[PDB]
């Protein structure tokens, strides 16, 4: 709205940049989109202002603005601020106990389940697949819960219509096997929900590594840290996941802990090569609730 005062830059990449801003006394996060990502800015804006997307575990919308002149375009998305930053940065220095670990993973599954499920009525919403789920697109709150942030690559589906993208978009390190070997049924909306579930299982692994049991804990590592380089190519990922049939390694110490044991069983059922065999977000949520 440019009544915002852009204080400090808290993120910078291909997507654009994210600024901590001040708007009427309160802190806000301002994502400044490139002109090359105009379609992503509008899709994310339209979910927020037309679908009325809102949930305790989804990044809170505040405002969206576009100003465009002949030879100038500025694309702003304004949301609630979260001073703890991404789950990725949060896991770097923090360790977790059983309670705070389950609060992180259950809140993520709660937000993902809310995205996936279609709601009917005048105040309803379509089914939504995220398609770029990863630890850098998840923010941590002060209460220890998380929200899902980046909705630019989302796809929607309403049973009341025949409405239905991008071929190979998303972080390659988090791509599902059916995306890498190109067998994904791009015309079934359920394929994108299952691609989100594969990514969710990778994040489960990232978080559980940082949970202490028996005085032990693992350093933060990204998924497949030990078998691919940084910025891995599409081919590197296809060799590791599709050909070598490799999955993130479960430390043996997890099995001495019954909580890390259940999360381990949850990860495996998100990593099936057969996408139809993978759990749904709703089933993951119910399972995580029983653990408490
Ligand atoms: C240097 N540190 C000092 C303090 N602390 C600040 C908290 O950092 C953020 C960063 C955000 O975005 C980054 C998240 C990781 O990937 C790069 C950007 C925040 C954020 N981002 C955001 C996303 Cl991911 C998606 C849509 C958005 C957004 O803001 C406007 O609309 N939103 C809220 N708070 C953030 C705090 C750590 C850094
Ligand atoms: K809040």
Residue numbers in the entry: 205 to 368, 372 to 499
Task: Show passages lifted from the paper.
Currently, no effective therapies exist for fibrodysplasia ossificans progressiva (FOP), a rare congenital syndrome in which heterotopic bone is formed in soft tissues owing to dysregulated activity of the bone morphogenetic protein (BMP) receptor kinase ALK2 (also known as ACVR1). All cases arise from an autosomal dominant germline mutation in the gene ACVR1 encoding the type I bone morphogenetic protein (BMP) receptor kinase ALK2 (11). Approximately 97% of patients with the classic FOP phenotype harbor the recurrent gain-of-function mutation R206H (c.617G>A). This substitution alters the structure of the receptor’s intracellular domain causing aberrant kinase activation and SMAD1/5/8 phosphorylation in response to activin A as well as hypersensitivity to BMP ligands. The BMP/TGF-β receptors form the only family of serine/threonine transmembrane receptor kinases but map favorably for drug repositioning to the tyrosine kinase-like branch of the human kinome.
Saracatinib is a potent inhibitor of the protein kinase ALK2. Saracatinib binds inactive ALK2 in an αC-in conformation. Within the ATP-binding pocket, the bound ligand was well resolved by the electron density map. Although the quinazoline of saracatinib formed a hydrogen bond to the hinge residue His286, specificity was likely derived from the large chlorobenzodioxole moiety, which nicely complemented the size, shape, and hydrophobicity of the back pocket. The tetrahydropyran ring was located in the ribose pocket below the glycine-rich loop (β1-β2), whereas the methylpiperazine moiety was extended largely into solvent. By contrast, the ALK2 complex exhibited an inactive conformation in which the αC helix was swung inwards to compress the ATP pocket. As a result, the equivalent αC (Glu248) and glycine-rich loop (Tyr219) residues were packed inside the ATP pocket where they mediated additional interaction with the chlorobenzodioxole and tetrahydropyran groups, respectively. Structural differences between the ALK2 and SRC complexes with saracatinib were evident from the different conformations of their catalytic domains. The previously determined SRC complex structure displayed an inactive αC-out conformation that widened the ATP pocket and rotated the αC residue Glu310 away to solvent, as well as the glycine-rich loop residue Phe278. Thus, further optimization of this chemotype could yield molecules with increased selectivity for ALK2 over SRC family kinases.
